[PDB]
C-alpha cells in the first residue's frame, strides 16, 4: 500500500517533470522511470537490464553485485555516473 | 516429463563436457589481460556510454575486452 502510495506522493513532481525530463535529455531520467519499471525498460531499449528486474526484489542479490561494481564500479567511473548508481539501489542501502 | 528434451540435455552436458577452453593463466586471453581495472586506458586517456556515443574507447581496451 506504502509503495504505490508514495508513488502517487512523489507523482505530479515526477509526472511534468520526469515528462520534460525524457522528451529534455539526458541521464538521470534512467534513475527517475526507476523510482517511477516495464515502461522504463521499454524506453531504455542489455546486462543492466536483467539487473534491473531484481528491482522490487528483496532478495540477497544486493551485497553481491553491490560490492562487485563498487571496486570496478569506481574503476570505470574513477577514469559511467548512470550504471554505479542503479548498483547502489540494488545494494539495498542507497 | 519431455524425456526427448531431456535427452537434448543429456546431448548439450555431453558437448560442454568435450569443449575446448583456452587457457587463463598460460595464453594470452586471461594472464596478459590482468589489467587492474576496466577501462583503464579510455579513464586515463581522453581518446552504455559507447553503444550512446561513436568513437570514445581506446584501442588497448577494446583489445582487452
Redesign the interface.
Known amino acids: 500500500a506504502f509503495s504505490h502510495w508514495l508513488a502517487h506522493t512523489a507523482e505530479e513532481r515526477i509526472e511534468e517533470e520526469v515528462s520534460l525530463y525524457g522528451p529534455e535529455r539526458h541521464v538521470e531520467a534512467v534513475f527517475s522511470f526507476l523510482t517511477g519499471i516495464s515502461d522504463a525498460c521499454r524506453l531504455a531499449q542489455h546486462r543492466l537490464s536483467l539487473l534491473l528486474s531484481q528491482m522490487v526484489g528483496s532478495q540477497e542479490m544486493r551485497e553481491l553485485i553491490s560490492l562487485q561494481l563498487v571496486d570496478w564500479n569506481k574503476l570505470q567511473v574513477d577514469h559511467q555516473e548512470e550504471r554505479l548508481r542503479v548498483f547502489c539501489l540494488l545494494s539495498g542501502t542507497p | 516429463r519431455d524425456t526427448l528434451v531431456r535427452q537434448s540435455q543429456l546431448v548439450v552436458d555431453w558437448l560442454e563436457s568435450i569443449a575446448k577452453d583456452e587457457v587463463g593463466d598460460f595464453s594470452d586471453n586471461i594472464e596478459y589481460y590482468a589489467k ?5 586506458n ?3 586517456t581522453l581518446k ?2 559507447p553503444i550512446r556515443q561513436k568513437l570514445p574507447l581506446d584501442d588497448l581496451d577494446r583489445e582487452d575486452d
Open positions: 587492474s581495472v576496466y577501462w583503464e579510455t579513464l586515463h552504455d556510454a
